[model samples]
Target chain A: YARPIIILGPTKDRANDDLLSEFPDKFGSCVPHTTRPKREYEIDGRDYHFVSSREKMEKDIQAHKFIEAGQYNSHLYGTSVQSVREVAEQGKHCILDVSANAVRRLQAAHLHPIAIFIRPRSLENVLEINKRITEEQARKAFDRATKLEQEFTECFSAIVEGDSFEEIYHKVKRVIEDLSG
Target chain B: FMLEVKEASPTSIQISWVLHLRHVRYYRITYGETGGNSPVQEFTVPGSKSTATISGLKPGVDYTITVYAVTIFSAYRSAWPPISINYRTGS
Candidate 1:
């Protein structure tokens, strides 16, 4: 018998920021890493896994971790390999909003992780949204507010939409639940 | 906009999109690669809920795809947000 498991990561859309922020300490949330020393109000493991660049890189190398680790705007961002295993071992289907490179590596490793690429609803619909707020402006505001990527490549076991997060959530939940059952 | 490509094979690709708008007459799919340089292959797919397969594509090549809907009022295309997936021969 297999226990139901779900691995969730951040989405590449600004609309999800509210939902994700509602759960700051949730088990699946990926914390930030900063080069500056931790503030007095910050807790080491809670706010972040604060570490020096040299130390983080060394640890990452030792673990064979990071399907795709790189610097983004002078800050490091990566998907840790251990995070995948940790979620998988819990008997839940681990889900990650990852890059195409990471998905390629995961697939190549025969991990068989489900990849779900998400695209905007339609050109007109997206244009309408863009009219109200440009993708660039929205991306900046969203990143400062949520620290997540706004655009995503279509490279998943399934592709969902960026317009309706609820619908996508239900569809993805159904798929994972069915797999777990 | 949710478009799902399922059971894709080397020669054929199955695609589905969910439309929440009204007065949509048909859908058109144009595909190639990123630069917008490749010949635009088009198909007229009818209905609100439908699946269309585009076949005769070169196997083992990555194809970037775009989809759109047409209605009485306007013809709406998806953003240049392309779908990049490899096509392989059907086993």
Candidate 2:
């Protein structure tokens, strides 16, 4: 009953934030819940929906409330199935940046998942990011995106690859435009 | 306490507003080709931002727009009194 736009990637360290800025009216963001503690400046539902109990989060996951979830360094990060429905209830697609596993489960949840894969640009893609991020970290990032493509490439409706954010933006915009047609 | 819309493009509009109330969380905007049981698109702006520009309108098509306030920490959501505006995209 709800339309879902899944932007599949390991991390949203790039233009996903910028792309989201342009389509606030056309899209609703899925607020992620994390077991991590709140910071001084961070506010729940804005920075990240802070779930107080990891146990409770896992219980919901077991109940199939989450499309996909994981524990990292004793913290859990997840997206609720109801959150996506809320976006559709408002007559907009829920734009999400999540794992490939989530995409698989989301597709099975009766939500039409329009998956878009943001391929990593070659040549030190993280150069603009953390200087200390070694080549291994970057290589892992590459392996991840490719593995997702290699394993579940059919899940994606479009693949966005370009030298700049504006270029990718133009491409993804086409996908959104076609979604309604 | 107020709202005003400025024309931007053939397919978009620039919406601006001001309020005397303190501690507003975000603005929820709703617009569509029709009103009253018709489907509408919704957008949200963080409390830090004041203005928003909407696109994907069509030339010479009349669309409906509504803006309402949501409080900080999701504590309060004011009723729209359901005020709406009809705007036709320019040719």
Evaluate all candidate structures by whole-model CA lDDT and list the values in order.
Answer: 0.47, 0.66
Clashing pairs in 2: B1-B19
lDDT of 2 by residue, A1-181 (tens): 3467776543332334444556667666666677988756558877567888888888898999877667754788667787777777787767665666677788777777888877767636533332334576667767777777888788888887765555666777787678754
Per-model TM-score versus the true fold: 0.42, 0.53
Q: For model 1, what is the error of residue A14's alpha carbon versus the real structure, in angstroms, after optimal superposition?
A: 6.0
Q: What local lDDT does model 1 show for residue A154?
A: 37
The TM-score measured for candidate 2 stands at 0.53
Task: Give interface RMSD, per candidate.
Answer: 17.9, 15.2
User: iRMS of candidate 1, one decimal?
Assistant: 17.9
Q: A43-106, model 1: which lDDT tens digit per residue?
A: 6654445667757655774565665565533555455555555545645444343445566666
lDDT of 2: 0.66
Q: CAPRI verdict on model 1?
A: incorrect
